[PDB]
Design an enzyme around this catalytic site. Structure first.
Site, PDB file in Angstrom:
ATOM      1  N   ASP A 334       0.147 -12.737  -3.927  1.00 28.32           N
ATOM      2  CA  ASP A 334       0.478 -11.386  -4.393  1.00 28.32           C
ATOM      3  C   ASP A 334      -0.763 -10.462  -4.325  1.00 28.32           C
ATOM      4  OD1 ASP A 334       2.624  -9.612  -5.736  1.00 28.32           O
ATOM      5  OD2 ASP A 334       0.978  -9.582  -7.189  1.00 28.32           O
ATOM      6  N   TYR A 465      -2.919  -1.264  -9.419  1.00 24.68           N
ATOM      7  CA  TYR A 465      -2.011  -0.374  -8.680  1.00 24.68           C
ATOM      8  C   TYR A 465      -2.481   1.079  -8.616  1.00 24.68           C
ATOM      9  CZ  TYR A 465       1.776  -3.903  -9.146  1.00 24.68           C
ATOM     10  OH  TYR A 465       2.545  -5.024  -9.040  1.00 24.68           O
ATOM     11  N   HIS A 523       9.653 -14.750  -4.925  1.00 21.94           N
ATOM     12  CA  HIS A 523       8.317 -14.189  -5.112  1.00 21.94           C
ATOM     13  C   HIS A 523       7.303 -15.127  -5.775  1.00 21.94           C
ATOM     14  CE1 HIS A 523       5.124 -11.318  -5.530  1.00 21.94           C
ATOM     15  NE2 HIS A 523       5.052 -11.560  -6.837  1.00 21.94           N
TER      16      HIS A 523
HETATM   17  C1  LIG Z   1      -0.802  -2.870   2.251  1.00 23.18           C
HETATM   18  O1  LIG Z   1      -1.116  -2.076   1.109  1.00 23.18           O
HETATM   19  C2  LIG Z   1       0.064  -1.568   0.577  1.00 23.18           C
HETATM   20  C3  LIG Z   1       1.077  -1.189   1.443  1.00 23.18           C
HETATM   21  C4  LIG Z   1       2.249  -0.668   0.944  1.00 23.18           C
HETATM   22  C5  LIG Z   1       2.392  -0.526  -0.418  1.00 23.18           C
HETATM   23  C6  LIG Z   1       3.619   0.032  -0.988  1.00 23.18           C
HETATM   24  C7  LIG Z   1       1.401  -0.888  -1.295  1.00 23.18           C
HETATM   25  C8  LIG Z   1       0.234  -1.411  -0.796  1.00 23.18           C
HETATM   26  S1  LIG Z   1      -0.953  -1.812  -2.067  1.00 23.18           S
HETATM   27  O2  LIG Z   1      -2.121  -2.371  -1.428  1.00 23.18           O
HETATM   28  O3  LIG Z   1      -1.066  -0.612  -2.868  1.00 23.18           O
HETATM   29  N1  LIG Z   1      -0.102  -2.963  -3.013  1.00 23.18           N
HETATM   30  C9  LIG Z   1      -0.335  -4.412  -2.835  1.00 23.18           C
HETATM   31  C10 LIG Z   1       0.995  -5.137  -2.696  1.00 23.18           C
HETATM   32  C11 LIG Z   1       1.317  -5.179  -1.214  1.00 23.18           C
HETATM   33  C12 LIG Z   1       2.432  -4.540  -0.696  1.00 23.18           C
HETATM   34  C13 LIG Z   1       2.725  -4.575   0.650  1.00 23.18           C
HETATM   35  C14 LIG Z   1       1.897  -5.251   1.521  1.00 23.18           C
HETATM   36  C15 LIG Z   1       0.778  -5.888   1.033  1.00 23.18           C
HETATM   37  C16 LIG Z   1       0.495  -5.844  -0.317  1.00 23.18           C
HETATM   38  C17 LIG Z   1       0.837  -6.550  -3.261  1.00 23.18           C
HETATM   39  C18 LIG Z   1       1.365  -6.751  -4.676  1.00 23.18           C
HETATM   40  N2  LIG Z   1       2.694  -6.220  -4.906  1.00 23.18           N
HETATM   41  C19 LIG Z   1       3.255  -6.195  -6.172  1.00 23.18           C
HETATM   42  O4  LIG Z   1       3.614  -5.166  -6.721  1.00 23.18           O
HETATM   43  N3  LIG Z   1       3.420  -7.421  -6.751  1.00 23.18           N
HETATM   44  C20 LIG Z   1       4.077  -7.574  -8.030  1.00 23.18           C
HETATM   45  C21 LIG Z   1       5.460  -8.111  -7.942  1.00 23.18           C
HETATM   46  C22 LIG Z   1       6.144  -8.399  -9.108  1.00 23.18           C
HETATM   47  C23 LIG Z   1       7.430  -8.905  -9.047  1.00 23.18           C
HETATM   48  C24 LIG Z   1       8.037  -9.133  -7.829  1.00 23.18           C
HETATM   49  C25 LIG Z   1       9.419  -9.683  -7.764  1.00 23.18           C
HETATM   50  C26 LIG Z   1       7.360  -8.831  -6.664  1.00 23.18           C
HETATM   51  C27 LIG Z   1       6.076  -8.323  -6.723  1.00 23.18           C
HETATM   52  C28 LIG Z   1       3.196  -5.249  -3.961  1.00 23.18           C
HETATM   53  C29 LIG Z   1       2.070  -4.366  -3.461  1.00 23.18           C
END
Ligand SMILES: COc1ccc(C)cc1S(=O)(=O)NCC1(c2ccccc2)CCN(C(=O)NCc2ccc(C)cc2)CC1
Ligand SMILES: COc1ccc(C)cc1S(=O)(=O)NCC1(c2ccccc2)CCN(C(=O)NCc2ccc(C)cc2)CC1
Lengths: 546, 546
Positions: A334, A465, A523
């Site tokens: 994650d 975030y 997840h």
């Molecule tokens: C490539 O970079 C980005 C590109 C687009 C976006 C929109 C944001 C980023 S980001 O780097 O801003 N976010 C990192 C992230 C990520 C998102 C996309 C790609 C790589 C990393 C990793 C962690 N994740 C998260 O929310 N996990 C908690 C969680 C809690 C419960 C459940 C069921 C699922 C997840 C999602 C966001």
């Protein structure tokens, strides 16, 4: 009524029995039958072997005495021992060949799971051989699964002397009729029988387990595949390193070998790796399971900027520096998966190898703001809800048990839609007040997360975030780079936020990338499919990280 | 007035300069002069090398671009490159050959000791080569000795661009006239000179240091041998393991490699190993420096029986079990030295190798009570004074600073006669109220012991002396044994309690024993003669413990 099970080591919990090698050597060397087993027991309760088993002398002291016994035995039987006959070589090979009898251990584990007190009772020696480590490792793996380990050489008593059985009952704090005793030697079984313990003579494992389930009333044979060994937080070594004046990082440490740094996601703990920690340590690795900045026993400063990727990564480099580690294998899930890719891109000299569960590596788009990029994917709406400081903290901190019960669910149990979260006004607005317990977690495991989160709450975790623009500008500096160090990407079929398709272009930036894929996995990869996670990670570590 | 010194890495803190290998290769391969150094700088501020040094691309990405530059350069000079010409091989060899320039580091260390802010400013690359670890290790050893490390590839700026010098002054929080800048490249020295920093062009180290001492007013050349690197308690990784419900063990952890467990004496700390911890970690070992039971951050239960050797050893085995270590090399001093010999005798499978400073291995006499045995040696009178619970605690806890100042003294500084202690009625009755500070310790180091001892006092530590009969009966069980695992005995000439002669019979019980001996060394071996302790222990570890 039974409530305690005792197991012998040789021929019971470990096979092939080191005993049988004397007979095997006789047959392979065409020596007279029983000649070696006879030299091994020369003098009976007064002989060299009993002195060894009582701890009077060590294994290296016993070797020349056994060699002298072999000579006297061959003399009497009118035979000759071969030229390079070495008792040392015979036993080195025998001990090394002896491995854990997995179905026997599985049965002991099941009995203990059902509230039985388990023990190992064994006639053993003080091993000072150059190759003593193999046995030390075996004894370490076995013993952790039992309440007691009684070694003849430590207690100064041996089977079949009746005192060792009275010592056994005393340590078990149990009357003999409450005890099952499993042994491969009928003579060592007799005193337990004489006292009125339930006894089982072990030849083939299968029949012994049939006798064991008949006598205990518990299914032990043909039973489903058990989960990997987990962690009891109070039984772990807990490490603490100050990386800067107000910031300390906590980690759990287990094993020896190449350092493996496990980096959890949101909103997690070092404990999210509970099923990986014993398995990776057993595979020959030194596991460092982090509480990432903002979590558990690690420091949680309130400032948003304290959680941008540049600073999180800098602190992880300082963590290695303070521990005196030139490198570590970095394994992330994650948000921890996102961090490990940046460690590989910005500090390759510090990263032995890199692996991510679920999180793909996606280069920053220099022609779009991360806000526009988040808006483009409807599944990423909850991320906008997480932006305003204090809003999500209030909802997530209101009822900790409800938070973790609602989040930690398998693919077939969902309570949470992460689309139209801002519209709905919260993550749990369409979620029950008292969620059911997911099959992936126990009530106790949920309460551990609840207690961990009571210290700092969700401010620090949510701050991960809140650095989109900062992270985007920093990641743009790496746009001309490629990841050329050993790398593994593990996709989870049913993760609906971090979908397998999102990783499809990774080969363009990581040409030598290796992959793993877990079907019917949501997840929460580590607890959803722990057996499969362990298999993928160990295979990759052994081939690509040494 | 100067108060900051900046050093370049290549050709200054590390030699031979990785730069000179292009010229060396030209000469060894009979290639036209300057051909390789010319291909290396092709394109100037726009070329492949600048992109590398700014962190735009990694070293593995740069390798094929440099190879293409070598081709164009050979084409223009009308020459041919040899068949197996590999830029990778040339640089692998060059980086690997580059070692720390010890006299330059010693000078930086001395300047920082005199209150200077020190920094490393270097044009370097993001190293993702298979053999990147060697350089990571070098960078780790060097950097710990400086306030700042400024790497071109991390800051996106290179020497000679003027921005990197303004960045340097900003991090130093210093005006240019307060700064000495040492560089081997005159062109990289010019912008610092232009700003008004004191500059030194480095060719031979000796002349550069003469210029450095002339300009700072500090002796740096021909200076005495400095002490080994010590430990700052707040900069260490601190580990904690619960071995039983009321007992936890604290340790300090540094390095990677075979586990080395350091066991202090009475009345000490993990901190007594401060000079050994960095050196052993640097030698390629994972150091676990204990606070022994009863001390520092480890638990101190009040019961005498909690400190007998059988239980102390059992807990050390449990400590290894909880950390997932099948073995450790056990190194003990004083009471810790006594413990390590029992670990070797009772748990050989857990002990990779054993070493004792000052403490000889003496088998229990089964025909004399330990009380009679203590009475036989007049130097052991203080041991009888330590018997009555509460008596010695009162004297030792009255003034903590006086206690440590009176105990921790070199052979030429004694304040304490340990003979006729019971008669005199105390250890310090003929000792001053305000002892002078021994040459072996600083005031700050004494105050660390004072603060450590404020937690539990002297009850737990004194309890180690209160199990004579218990220890004697347990040790009698090992009378038929020999220590046959790798073992080292280090004697200290001037230890008047643990005299070298007391170890003279050890060969009878440890036939393969190796020895070390330190002349003009008192009881407090580790702080008295740290350089010699480090040399003896590292040589023995590398040959006998791997
Ligand atoms: C490539 O970079 C980005 C590109 C687009 C976006 C929109 C944001 C980023 S980001 O780097 O801003 N976010 C990192 C992230 C990520 C998102 C996309 C790609 C790589 C990393 C990793 C962690 N994740 C998260 O929310 N996990 C908690 C969680 C809690 C419960 C459940 C069921 C699922 C997840 C999602 C966001
Ligand atoms: C072989 O066993 C024994 C045999 C005889 C006797 C009389 C006791 C034992 S013993 O096992 O009871 N004592 C262990 C001991 C030891 C004594 C002799 C041999 C081995 C171990 C090691 C620690 N030591 C001690 O007092 N250090 C503190 C200290 C503080 C300040 C200074 C300047 C010096 C020392 C001396 C006693």
């Amino acid at each position: 009524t039974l409530r305690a099970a005792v197991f012998d080591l040789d021929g019971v919990l470990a096979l092939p029995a080191v005993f049988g090698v004397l007979g095997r050597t006789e047959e392979a060397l065409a020596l007279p039958r029983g000649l070696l087993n006879d030299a091994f027991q020369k003098g009976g309760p007064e002989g060299a072997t009993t002195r060894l088993m009582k701890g009077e002398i060590t294994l290296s002291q016993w070797i020349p005495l056994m060699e002298e016994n072999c000579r006297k035995c061959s003399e009497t039987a009118k035979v000759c021992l071969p030229k390079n006959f070495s008792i040392k070589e015979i036993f080195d090979k025998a001990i090394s060949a002896r491995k854990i009898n997995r179905p026997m251990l599985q049965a002991a584990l099941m009995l203990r799971k059902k509230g039985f007190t388990t023990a190992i009772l064994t006639n053993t020696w003080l091993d000072d051989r150059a190759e003593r480590d193999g046995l030390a490792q075996l004894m370490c793996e076995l013993k952790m699964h039992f309440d007691f380990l009684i070694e003849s050489c430590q207690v100064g008593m041996v089977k079949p002397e009746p005192q060792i059985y009275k010592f056994l009952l005393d340590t078990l704090k149990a009357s003999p009729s409450e005890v099952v005793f499993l042994d491969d030697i009928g003579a060592n079984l007799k005193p337990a029988r004489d006292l009125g313990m339930v006894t089982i003579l072990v030849q083939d494992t299968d029949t012994a387990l049939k006798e064991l389930e008949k006598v205990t009333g518990i299914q032990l044979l043909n039973t489903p595949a058990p989960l990997p060994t987990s962690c009891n937080p109070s039984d772990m070594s807990h490490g603490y390193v100050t990386v800067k004046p107000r910031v300390r990082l906590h980690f759990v440490e287990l094993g020896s070998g190449p350092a493996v740094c496990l980096c959890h996601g949101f909103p997690e703990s070092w404990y999210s790796w509970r099923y990986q920690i014993p398995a990776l340590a057993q595979a020959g690795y030194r596991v460092l399971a982090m509480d990432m900045k903002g979590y558990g026993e690690s420091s949680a400063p309130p400032e948003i900027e304290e959680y941008c990727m540049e600073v999180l990564c800098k602190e992880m480099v300082t963590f290695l520096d303070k521990l005196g580690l030139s490198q570590a294998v970095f394994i992330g899930h994650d948000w921890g998966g996102m961090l490990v890719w940046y460690m590989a891109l910005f500090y390759p000299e510090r990263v032995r190898a890199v692996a991510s569960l679920n999180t793909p590596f996606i280069p920053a788009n220099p022609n779009m703001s991360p806000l526009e990029s988040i808006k483009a994917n409807p599944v990423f709406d909850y991320q906008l809800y997480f932006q305003e400081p204090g809003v999500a903290e209030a909802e997530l901190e209101q009822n900790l048990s409800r938070t973790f019960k609602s989040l930690f669910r398998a693919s077939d149990e969902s309570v949470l839609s992460m689309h139209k979260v801002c519209e709905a006004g919260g993550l749990f607005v369409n979620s029950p007040e008292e969620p059911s317990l997911s099959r992936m977690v126990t009530e106790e495991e949920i309460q551990f997360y609840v207690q961990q989160f009571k210290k700092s709450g969700f401010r620090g975790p949510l701050n991960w975030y809140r650095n989109m623009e900062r992270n985007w500008k920093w990641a743009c500096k790496s746009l001309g780079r490629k990841i050329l160090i050993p790398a593994l990407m593990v996709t989870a079929e049913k993760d609906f936020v971090l979908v397998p398709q999102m990783s499809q272009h990774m080969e363009d930036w990581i040409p030598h990338l290796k992959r793993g894929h877990i079907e019917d996995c949501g997840h929460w990869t580590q607890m959803d499919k722990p057996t499969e996670v362990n298999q993928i990670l160990i295979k990759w570590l052994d081939s690509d990280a040494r």
